Amino acid sequence: SLTETYHQAYQSKATDGFYMPVLSSSRDNPFHPPQPRAIAVYGSFLARGCLDPVSEAHEADGPTHDIYRLNVADDVAPLFNTGVVWFEGISPKFSLKLKTRTVLQYIPTSGSVLANFTRHEPTYDQIALDAADRLRNLMPHAYPAAYNDWGWLGDLLDSAISMLPGVGTVYNIAKPLIKPAWNWLGNKVSDFFGNPVARDG
Amino acid sequence: QYIPTSGSVLANFTRHEPTYDQIALDAADRLRNLMPHAYPAAYNDWGWLGDLLDSAISMLPGVGTVYNIAKPLIKPAWNWLGNKVSDFFGNPVARDG
Amino acid sequence: AVVTAAGLAWLRQYLNPMGPDTTSVTGYPDGSAVTTCIA
Amino acid sequence: AVVTAAGLAWLRQYLNPMGPDTTSVTGYPDGSAVTTCIADYSNTFNVSFPPREALYCTGSSSSEKPTLVDADNYAKIDKWSNYDITLCVLALPMLRNVVMLRLYPHTPTAFALTEQTPNFPQRFPNWSVYSADGTRFNNGDEPGYLQSYVYLPNVDKHLSAARGYRLLSRGITGIFSAPALETQGFVTACQYLAEGSIQSQSIKSDAVRSVTVNSDGTVKNVESSSQTVSSMPRYVFPLDGDNCAPSSLTETYHQAYQSKATDGFYMPVLSSSRDNPFHPPQPRAIAVYGSFLARGCLDPVSEAHEADGPTHDIYRLNVADDVAPLFNTGVVWFEGISPKFSLKLKTRTVLQYIPTSGSVLANFTRHEPTYDQIALDAADRLRNLMPHAYPAAYNDWGWLGDLLDSAISMLPGVGTVYNIAKPLIKPAWNWLGNKVSDFFGNPVARDG
Amino acid sequence: AVVTAAGLAWLRQYLNPMGPDTTSVTGYPDGSAVTTCIADYSNTFNVSFPPREALYCTGSSSSEKPTLVDADNYAKIDKWSNYDITLCVLALPMLRNVVMLRLYPHTPTAFALTEQTPNFPQRFPNWSVYSADGTRFNNGDEPGYLQSYVYLPNVDKHLSAARGYRLLSRGITGIFSAPALETQGFVTACQYLAEGSIQSQSIKSDAVRSVTVNSDGTVKNVESSSQTVSSMPRYVFPLDGDNCAPSSLTETYHQAYQSKATDGFYMPVLSSSRDNPFHPPQPRAIAVYGSFLARGCLDPVSEAHEADGPTHDIYRLNVADDVAPLFNTGVVWFEGISPKFSLKLKTRTVLQYIPTSGSVLANFTRHEPTYDQIALDAADRLRNLMPHAYPAAYNDWGWLGDLLDSAISMLPGVGTVYNIAKPLIKPAWNWLGNKVSDFFGNPVARDG
Amino acid sequence: AVVTAAGLAWLRQYLNPMGPDTTSVTGYPDGSAVTTCIADYSNTFNVSFPPREALYCTGSSSSEKPTLVDADNYAKIDKWSNYDITLCVLALPMLRNVVMLRLYPHTPTAFALTEQTPNFPQRFPNWSVYSADGTRFNNGDEPGYLQSYVYLPNVDKHLSAARGYRLLSRGITGIFSAPALETQGFVTACQYLAEGSIQSQSIKSDAVRSVTVNSDGTVKNVESSSQTVSSMPRYVFPLDGDNCAPSSLTETYHQAYQSKATDGFYMPVLSSSRDNPFHPPQPRAIAVYGSFLARGCLDPVSEAHEADGPTHDIYRLNVADDVAPLFNTGVVWFEGISPKFSLKLKTRTVLQYIPTSGSVLANFTRHEPTYDQIALDAADRLRNLMPHAYPAAYNDWGWLGDLLDSAISMLPGVGTVYNIAKPLIKPAWNWLGNKVSDFFGNPVARDG
Questions:
Q1: Which residues in chain D have their CB less than 8 angstroms from residue C37's CB?
Q2: In angstroms, what CA-CA distances link A14 with A95, A143, D293, F311, F422?
Q3: Where on the tree of life does the source sit, at the highest rank (chain C) (predicted)?
Q4: 3-state SS class at D281
Q5: Which residues fall within 8 angstroms of residue E230, CB to CB, at 6 or more apart?
Q6: Residue A79's Cα: distance from chain center in Å?
């Protein structure tokens, strides 16, 4: 279902692993106070209830969606995507090395440990935020585990996407952007600028 | 618009063409406060729409402009009761229905 | 720097849903990159 | 005098239904001037050797009882799995039940059917067993082969809510896979027109024979109602079951496709007619013509024996459907297949509906009745040149479109504008020997 | 390379049968090289609300008795006359019985028929009543609608004395009239191909069940002759009765004609085929396809239940005739009609006969087998462009002939001599809004 | 843009099957791309007045007994031989049984058939007698005419071993001879399309009527199984038997051939269609449509009487065969023939087979699927111009090929390269008056 639905979904052989950078879905990232709360997942409703003309008594058993409690409490990062990866038909003697990197900003409370590690340099950059918002819909959902340090990033993708926001442009043309083909399964992979990606890992 | 679930009826009728247009969204946001709330039942196919209203509202968003001046925009008078109706550009609207 | 045909079509169908000119339907111009069906 | 873009797109989707570039569906270029919705059904199935729980008996065992599972006669089928097997897929022009799958212990001499109507034919995930002597299978008999129908339910749902339909294109891909050092086998595929029609077979009636011995009642109603009548009408396919063996198909049709099993197959089912009119949905019982035994009036006989003339056997499939007329019937055989195989069977069927008012289809209409006679003429011309099948991975043909459709579109009539597009030569589709050539002589290196 | 005069005359009489200039009849331009006589039947009828003496019951009341008049249930029909009514005229391709008229108290949801064969269908001046619950009407029931057949007797007389026939053209004019300040109502008209064929429905036979208790006679002839057989063959029309409501017809077909009731209608019934071969006269019972109820073999069922598969209901009209094949079926609805209306129904039917030797037709022969492929190609091309109907007074179209036929005759093939006759644009037949435009943009001011 | 050599050869063999230059057989130019073998059957028969030993009765005399010879009623047939006689040959499109011969004492008013199925129809050397009152003949009745079938056994043998067939061409030559000063008589010949189809006639069933008087058994199974059903399917030819008299044929068809008896005839049976597809061999009972007597539903009748509507009489020939579809049916009459005549009947039938694998035909294959649309278009164009027959010795027409085929091949479409080949004028085939003219005005002096 995920492969059919989402175009940027990543597929490959199990040996390729995966590398998913979770992306935000909003252009703003306001601070929020820590507030752990019990997490749950919406299910599906069974009784139609007032979805059809019914009596007053049956309004109560209207469309009520099942809520699956996880018995886990946490505070979530709003507007961040949910990722899901499947390894299908892998050997039962497998070994997965999971490596997670989570970087997040805090406002330390007075007399707390965080107060000893402070970055007093607040910068402002509207262009970067607009570029990230624009790139949100272009980047693939995942890459092979060894496909870090993409060549096309930074001064080609970021640059070539940097003049489009409004007309806030000083450099006329950086590089035309073509639709990449992330066909990892058939080894016919082309980057954002048509340059082929030979397997380096 | 729908995102069909797998093995559902909607999956047989799919448009695989996602387009991106920031200018159109900004123009709609700008026009939100100018358009009348309703029109006479027979007043479809407005002449002033599309390449006059949309165009003349299209250079204002930021400065994302290539065409210098399209058409100055004047405040319309939608006095349907007294038949003294003027469109967004001062052109009178004679009753066609 | 200029509006596209799809953006203009969406604007027309959003501002004039029952206009006779609007014949074909167009999606929201945001590049959602998902499989969509317009009804 | 020039083929439009819509006609070219329809030609591409008709000749290459499963091509990667084929994303937006386009209707038949005839200018029908009606409100229509084009539906595209893409389905994927994983066919393999079925387990015991997926097998059911077709004999009188499950006569009025529900589908009855095999009573652990699965040992013989495991013995089949000890040796190599044979796969057969038959794509009749039926809208739903897109293909019929058959498992054989070894390659048969013909595509035989059962004389008696089978009980509860099973959709793909479940199979049904048939005996080795060409009869329905009850528990304790000798299994001959397995049979299943690959069913599309959305097609049925949409056909129910439609005033008219017509099949635009159909393609079947057969991606084959097997464990390492176990990839032996050959694949054959062939298309041919089996123009079915609504016919009724000739049956006999029941005459009462009453001997009333009563003194007052001596009517003796011995009336001879044992005449010859016509059974219920069925859509009968004149498919050459006796001539559907692989070798006969290869030796008969020149465009038939043969290759190694690992290459799979990709069959773009074609149409045998130039016109594709709308037809009202009308499901009917599907049957297949057989052969006749009694010559009857084929020799000089009495007026009494003319009744039992050349009556052709009609095999009932116990499946009801509406078929796409004038579309080809396809047969593909996988011979010498390792029993631990896997077949990713993909199907893409695009068809145009006229939505019934208030139906769910009416919300997906698409109104541009384009008209392009050049595209239809090119499709008619190209019918005899395109091969019946290609390897599974041989999509996105370079010679298609700007090269083949252009080299054909200026042939019809005198409707020619360009001087000469490109000369057309006879291709050589020798996939077995790896010496494949296109319609213009360009070689093809294998991409799998 | 140029259309002859005979071909142009035939095209004019085919597209505009009731045009004022159409006086001399011309045959089909195919060079048949046979002795033929062209007959032109012009008939006029005055349809209005029937009195009590013109109404007859269709139920079992007149089963074997002759046509039985309404036993003063005419009070309910007068109550109909208190309100507005609905008229329907259905022009099937039947040669005689040119149209069928129906009176409704209000617009129906579908063009329904009776399941049981009606008794004594009545020709136009007499009507026959049908119940409100879709059944035949006996005295004391609830009348649902009135039905009549408009019959041409000369057509029957001439068809009897002919070796072969073919319909050349047919047109129906519907001049509407009503008292002053009582002219409300709308008129809709639509043509569509209902390609009938000779089919037999599936019926059940009668099995004898004898229990002979005699001591000497204990045969017990319990023979099961309750099999499924085919009824007598009938010419069945696949007309979408459930989809013949006015709104559905307008929303489905683009060329459908809608206007005010006072405008009447003028339907030039067209042909759906390029070839018009001669056919031998062969009257047959006329029936209409319905819908099916039991799915039968549309789902996996036992071999015993395959007999009662998707059997489509066939409604018998109790009318025998020979139909003109490939000619369109027309439906026109007058909704919201004042009950004190008047309809001058004119019909013009021109058809070619091959006279039987010694028959009365042999004295009216006319031998010039002209041949014109360009005219036939132009007629084929123009089928999808001409609207299905026009207002009653909209004869003698200026755009026809020198303008439309010329702008079409150079399209086919490369058979073009003149550089450019006139560009062709899409017309707008908006009779309701009085914004009508021709194929060349010229407006039309109303002439009535 | 130019007709190939294979297409020209096929055209020559199709229009002039018995021409002296026609030696090598060529297939249909459609590019079928299948393995085919062309078979050419040339047969010669010596028809004359049969002796007594060659005559058999068709009545109930030989009902289940074998063919029963005339019990010396041959005196009446000798009395026929005292006067002049009439010959009739009817070439139906049946593959075997190429023609049917009939001997009459005098010219009949129609080509009548027997209502009851005849017993043991006899192949050519043996004839079968039919009574003068249009019934089967038993010994002691009044003989009306003699009938025989001319049979090709090799055609049957080859049709048995073939997957598909199509008739390429057929010609029948009728060389006539008679003693000196005894050569009076006239010959007439005419071709016309009798497009048969697989139809079933409407028959009645047998309803049991049991009156069980037993005290315990009082079931009274009086079930009404006397309904109307369909008989076994037969291939029915709609040949105008009532309109097959010589004078009517001459007055109806312009291309009909008339001449003196000594001139014989030469009929190149033509095809009425542009497409000639392969068909699977499928022999079936052959029958002929007659006329109807009861009008039935042709008039307003009760729902009970609609069953016995216009039911057309179907005459069973008691002969089973497969026919060549869309090929013309030919009739030739020899009137006023001296009874001591002789007819050398030659037949040439060329047809293409698809050989069944392992059959005897597979050793005679000939693989060059040529494609020529121009030849097919020329054949379609020439159908209405060639006369239906020629004198027996009028082979090797000079106007054929370089003159007629060239003067026609540039007409279709705009596919014309040469400026002008030769103007085409209407020929005058007045063989009776010895004023014959070709398509170009060149006279023909008699060569016999």
A1: 364
A2: 11, 12, 59, 74, 78
A3: Viruses
A4: coil
A5: D200, D229, D230, D231, D232, D233, E200, E201, E202, E203, F200, F229, F230
A6: 9
Number of Cβ within 10 Å of residue D47's Cβ equals 21
- CA of A51 to nearest chain C CA: how many angstroms apart? 21
- Residue E91 to residue E330: CA distance in whole angstroms: 5
Residues 6+ apart with CB under 8 A from A115: A108, A109
Comparing alpha-carbon positions, the chain B residue that sits nearest to A163 is: B64
CB atoms within 10 A of CB E44: 10
Distance CA A97, CA D249 (A): 54
D contact residues 228-257, partner F, Cβ 8 Å cutoff: 228-230, 238, 240, 243, 247-248, 251-255
Q: Is E182 helix (H, G, I), strand (E, B) or coil?
A: coil
CA distance D196 to D193: 9
Amino acid at residue number A136: R
Cα distance from B72 to chain A (closest Cα, Å)?
23
Beta-bridge partner residues of E43: E347
Strands of the E37-47 sheet, one edge to the other: E37-47, E342-355, E162-177, E266-269
- Site of tokens 């037999």: E200
| D229 touches F229 (CB < 8 A) | yes
Q: Which chain B residues are closer than 8 Å to D154 by Cβ? A: 7, 9, 11-12
Find out whether E119 and F303 touch, Cβ atoms under 8 Å. Answer: yes
Q: Is F387 left (phi over 0), alpha (psi -120 to 50) or beta?
A: beta
> Alpha-carbon distance E274 to F74, whole Å?
56
- Coil/strand/helix, residue E50: coil
Q: What secondary structure does DSSP assign to chain A, as a single string? A: -HHHHBTT-----GGG--B----BSSS---------EEEEEE------GGGSS--SGGGTTSS---EEEEEEEE---TTBPPP-----S--TT--------------PPTTSGGGGS--------HHHHHHHHHHTTTS-S-B-TT--S-TTTTTTHHHHHHSSSTT--SSS--------EEETTTTEEE-TTS-B-----
Q: Do the beta carbons of residue F173 and residue F346 sit within 8 Å? A: yes
The resolution, in Å, is: 3.3
Phi (first) and psi of residue F55, to 5 degrees: -115, 135
Q: Within 13 Å of residue D421, how many CA atoms lie on the same side as its CB?
A: 17
Q: Which residues of E touch D323 (CB under 8 A)?
A: none
In whole angstroms, what is the distance from residue F80 CA to residue F82 CA? 5
Nearest in space to D343 (alpha carbons), one of D122, D109, D88? D88
Torsion of CA E285, E286, E288, E289, to 10 degrees: 50
Pairing relation of β-strands F284-289 and F234-237?
parallel
Q: Are E328 and E191 in contact (CB under 8 A)?
A: yes
All residues at 6 or more sequence positions from B28 whose CB lies less than 8 Å from its CB, including other chains: C11, C14, C15
Instruction: Tell me which DSSP letter residue E107 carries.
Output: -
Sign of CA dihedral F131, F136, F139, F141: negative
Helix, strand, coil content of chain D in percent (nearest 5): 15, 30, 55
Cα–Cα distance measured from residue E206 to residue E227, given in angstroms and rounded to the nearest whole number: 8
Closest CA to E145 of E118, E164, E127, E119: E127
- Chains in contact with A, where contact means 3 or more Cβ–Cβ distances below 8 Å, are B, C
- Residue E357: helix, strand or coil by DSSP? coil
Alpha carbon of residue F260 to chain centroid: 22
Strands E234-237 and E197-199: antiparallel
Instruction: Quote the crossing angle between the two packed helices E5-15 and E373-382, to the nearest 10°.
Output: 30
Q: State CA D329 to chain mean position distance.
A: 5
CB proximity list for E175: less than 8 A, separation 6 or greater: E264, E343, E344, E345, E346, E392
